[PDB]
Amino acid sequence: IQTERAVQQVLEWGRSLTGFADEHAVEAVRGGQYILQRIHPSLRGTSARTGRDPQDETLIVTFYRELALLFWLCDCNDLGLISPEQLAAVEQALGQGVPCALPGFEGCAVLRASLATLAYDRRDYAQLLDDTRCYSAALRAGHAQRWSYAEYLHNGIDSIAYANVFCCLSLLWGLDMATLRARPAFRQVLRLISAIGRLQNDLHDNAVILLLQRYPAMPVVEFLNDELAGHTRMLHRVMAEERFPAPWGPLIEAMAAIRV
Amino acid sequence: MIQTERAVQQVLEWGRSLTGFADEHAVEAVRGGQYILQRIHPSLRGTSARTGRDPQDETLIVTFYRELALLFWLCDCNDLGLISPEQLAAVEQALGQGVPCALPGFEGCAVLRASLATLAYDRRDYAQLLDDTRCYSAALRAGHAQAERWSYAEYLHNGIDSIAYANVFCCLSLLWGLDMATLRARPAFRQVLRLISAIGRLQNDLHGADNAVILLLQRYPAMPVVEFLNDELAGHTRMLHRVMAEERFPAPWGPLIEAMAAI
Ligand SMILES: C=C1CC[C@@H]2C(C)(C)CCC[C@@]2(C)[C@@H]1CC/C(C)=C/COP(=O)(O)OP(=O)(O)O
Ligand SMILES: C=C1CC[C@@H]2C(C)(C)CCC[C@@]2(C)[C@@H]1CC/C(C)=C/COP(=O)(O)OP(=O)(O)O
């Protein structure tokens, strides 16, 4: 599959989601192509064991649809694209992997049914449902926020959705994240790359704003930038000290620079 | 409960086998240790029938106090350069690997470590203590190494290890059979561990070796450093409270974490 075929396949499915915008499909495919391209070499290697082809169109489009779903949900929250009633119904459906009870959101059932069918290790599917609920809640709790930088960063780590991205990749290509999750070190890296992602976004409510409202005289911009530097170094140190199975090393690095 | 001065003397007797050990190390260890044991005493009484570990066992108590004195002494070895870099490295090897120290003047290390191994209710806790000892050691040196200054993030991550709460909890679990090795399998438990440790680190830096306050002030002179940290400390406390509520950890973990927050 090239690019517009993927974009159109994501867009076609998006028509079954009220509030879906073209950009949700376009940016999901662009970000998704970026990640898959950076981990391709590592993937084809594991392809021997799993039997999951890096170029499998079905797997690629499903991965892109999950990314589009994440972008769409974020806008639904930040921009009120759909009603609060609709959002609650959609989040309930996506979090349990069942059809939405309200009309105009058939895409939820389609995507989740697909993920269940394609899950290499079904434990990743349950984990994805879990990450979806966490994500939904972090978007809501953050929108409704008095917040300390610590609490902000803790919630932001879940609202950035990197955990969901990793879990979807594991689900489709059999990357055994369900097993790697048991290692405290892996969990640590997950938190760091996510915080990196959250800071990069807030810098590019939001961190900068939150700290400015509270500390008018604080160089919040440089501070937050040092924080980003700080987290990146800690990520590297742990990446070395620990040795994660392909394609996790290139994947984590890919996520760190997705600011391209 | 062994009398205070009798415990101090027992800690001091062992401490005499560590170059640079000072009376203060034993005295402060017994004071902090008694504070902790008194606050979790009712709980330990409750688990004693199951474990066979008596809250008033002098051997267990003195051993816990000696580990606390060890941590105080190590902090000073770094902070005041009581021993040479070569001697500190050898001490870290013995305490972090559980082997005899290759250099003379530190017999107390292998002695305390051997007692802990022998006394461990669940031997996993001993290996955990060795791990926590390595983290604590590395953190003391990293902090002291702190030129290119650390980010607040890097500081707190390191201060979480340098505060030694993990070590204290692990030693308690080893001695009184508190099943920390199993509880550590729960993500929520590991989170409260990082939380209570960050809390202890912030409180220490504010109340009264790189310091959070002097750190943020040298890099961000204009920012209201102290105000910020006090806000971050309240933030960690709120997070801790909610997790402790959501999750209902077996006794004595609730009282133990509560006691550390107030110490
Ligand atoms: C919109 C996005 C497209 C997909 C893309 C991938 C490929 C997953 C790589 C990471 C970035 C991204 C998810 C990208 C951005 C997603 C999104 C709009 C983030 C907005 O912030 P978020 O963490 O959702 O919380 P908040 O609502 O912004 O507070
Ligand atoms: C490890 C120590 C022994 C036990 C003691 C109790 C009894 C729990 C009371 C709280 C302190 C402590 C945990 C104590 C801590 C030793 C130590 C000096 C903690 C401060 O961190 P440290 O590594 O010294 O870095 P810094 O010098 O504060 O920058």
UniProtKB/Swiss-Prot annotation, chain A:
Coiled-coil parts of chain: none
- Annotated InterPro entries: Isoprenoid_synthase_dom_sf (IPR008949)
| Pfam families recorded | Terpene_syn_C_2 (PF19086)
What superkingdom does the record give? Bacteria
Protein name, as recorded: Uncharacterized protein blr2150
- Which source organism does the UniProt entry give? Bradyrhizobium diazoefficiens (strain JCM 10833 / BCRC 13528 / IAM 13628 / NBRC 14792 / USDA 110)
